[model samples]
Target: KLHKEPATLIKAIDGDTVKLMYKGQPMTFRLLLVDTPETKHPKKGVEKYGPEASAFTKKMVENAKKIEVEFDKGQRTDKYGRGLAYIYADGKMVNEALVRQGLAKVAAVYAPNNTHEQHLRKSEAQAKKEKLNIWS
Candidate 1:
């Protein structure tokens, strides 16, 4: 969907998602282009670095007063009807930042926005080289 320009901030990041009171609606966002496995999951349990990922995400998004977004052809909603978009806070691409810090992985299964794919790959490569989550 077309979000009005000059994006606004609603609230702090809650866990792995951000609570943005956008356009008078309480919208939550999961940074697109990456998935940090599952943490605090009841059935699947926490994957490697799941807690770290969530913590990292919280750090990246929580309490930020201003943020930006760029959506691909699929708009905001993906096939699962979940919001799919790239998020940038204080000029830092949240998804890329997460992967670069070894907190997330490229979890692309749909048609790529390719918006941050290269950066994500580079981040993952560096993470692998340093063996952040690969061997741990």
Candidate 2:
């Protein structure tokens, strides 16, 4: 089960992370169930496909009229203090959208927090079959 709430997007930090204004306070959320290439890396510098993924995320978040985030039942934040969530924009799950578009891949399957795992995997499969973007 997942709990949903509306949040104001401040900016997208990367393909799979965003900065938001939640409950009148600034917060960072790590988008659940998907991982994009790293635009910002401590050691490896920029990864392949990183820029494309980041740009896709920025366009999706910035163009949306509304945004909402869904959280798992417990332990909302990760160890780094960023909240883990599934982001919804214009009624579409942004996490799934990224995966479907081949801009991201399914990752970090934590138990009980993977409400959308099947859907995400399906999206990835389709993208892979089509050899879209990173899949190429």
Candidate 3:
């Protein structure tokens, strides 16, 4: 773990975003290395499978007993100042799970922060082969 911190989910915003409390400090996070269909973008509006994606994440984070946010060696925050991290719920990485579940695509392949690139790609390929959601 580069920099793993225990967190509490304040709100599961969508498939690839969340609001959390880390060390008693509130932070918004954009799940690293993935992007789900848009649900809240004003211009994009509600996209296909967006609702299901968000709903799945909502259930996932809510059901978890413990959550951890892992930061890589790259920039800690995006231009929007939202923390970029890999969300882990009960020791299971929600980032890869989103791709594996076919809800998100493995995007944003930036270096240093791409430690899980191949792993995520493998999950994405499986989703692609299965013709799941984003891949569908």
Candidate 4:
């Protein structure tokens, strides 16, 4: 918790992302360690396993009593200049939750943004060995 910051969950947008309380407004943040099957919407917005993954994220996030964000020492924003950080819900890593449950894969990683990469990688290994959702 050395480089962590308090984050209020405004919305759980997807399996690996959320809208968190920023200075004047809530900003969308993408987890650095997880990528889920996207709930793409051309019109009605439906995809295989996408909705379920997103549903679970909201379930976990919306019910959290506390939420925080852990940032890397280097970059913290993406191409869109949006917040990109590891999310914590009630002291548990949300990114790790997605990977452990197989709703998301450990991905979208880059240099200097791996504070908990090993932890997530270990969780991913367990999820893969079990062959749950993403691995299945």
Candidate 5:
């Protein structure tokens, strides 16, 4: 079973990173099982399809009535200190939604924490077939 907590959206840093308020504390969370194109970088700058992905994520997160963050057993935070999580918004998995909509690509698969990896990959395949957004 995964551990879950109710959270409030503070802001979207980009497509895959979000600032959230959890348990009255602000935290930075990196969406699990998917990666969006880079909208900001110190060296590489913005990549192709980056802005669209960011906008897509922002809209989905902001429009949701409720949001929750879930973590797999023994996997809580990444090396960079950002919380690794699956965000559910309005009962929909926001991470999967991004991939299903072609706004992100499947990335950083890890054991136990990758509960949605297969689903995410399938969504990517569908997006690739349809040439949607980043896949285009």
Candidate 6:
């Protein structure tokens, strides 16, 4: 039936990058439609809110008890070559949570899911309104 599985949070590579082990597969996931500053990029200086982004992400997913990965169209490897997914934990979409917290922006470069799109937009709007993590 391929029901939703509970994944363990392995680590957060960067502000917007995360790794999870699902069904014995260690998959690296890059949040879709948003790009955080490069913590490792040699060029482009560390962005204004880069550290906050990373810290927020780390707090959200690090040591999570369980996580869920949902598939979408174009679920194949992303252009940069990382696996794409919609992640949820504790009944919330982790990416959406980041957007809601104003730590990320919608970055849908692939096909659109109206529902998720709306969720992300709304989340971002809320974050912007609250300024939850803009400056950390």
Looking at model 1, which ten-residue stretch has the lowest summed lDDT? Answer: 1-10
Instruction: Find the 10 residues in a row with the least total lDDT in model 2.
Output: 41-50
As for candidate 6, its clashing pairs are 33-107, 33-108
Count of backbone clashes for each model?
A: 0, 0, 0, 0, 0, 2
List the RMSD of every prediction in angstroms. Answer: 3.2, 1.1, 1.1, 2.3, 1.3, 2.9
- The regions of model 6 sitting more than 4 angstroms off are 1-3, 112-115, 131-136
Candidate 4 per-residue C-alpha lDDT over 41-75 given as tens digits, one digit per residue, 9 for 90 to 100: 54646557788889988998899998888887668
Candidate 2 root-mean-square deviation in Å: 1.1
C-alpha lDDT of candidate 1 relative to the true structure: 0.66
Give the alpha carbon lDDT tens digit for every residue of 2-45 in model 5.
76689999999998899999889999999998888898866777
Q: Candidate 2, which segments miss by more than 4 Å at Cα?
A: none
Q: For model 3, how does the per-residue alpha-carbon lDDT over 2-109 read when each residue is reduced to its tens digit?
A: 867899989989888899998789999999999898798669878998898898888899999999999988898999989988899999899898899899998969
- Candidate 1 lDDT over 6-77, as tens digits, reads 356565442346666555666667667787767656588777787777777677666566677667555676
In order of appearance, the predictions have TM-scores of 0.78, 0.95, 0.95, 0.89, 0.93, 0.81
Candidate 5 has its poorest 10 consecutive residues by lDDT at 108-117
Candidate 2 lDDT over 3-98, as tens digits, reads: 679899998988888999998999999989888989897787579888988898889989999999999766789999999889998888889989
Error of 6 at 34 (Å): 2.5
Per-candidate local distance difference test: 0.66, 0.89, 0.89, 0.82, 0.88, 0.71
Name the lDDT value of residue 72 in candidate 1. 59
- On the 0 to 100 scale, the lDDT of residue 36 in model 3 is 90
Model 5: how far is 111 from its true place, Å?
1.6
List candidate 5 segments past 4 Å from native: none
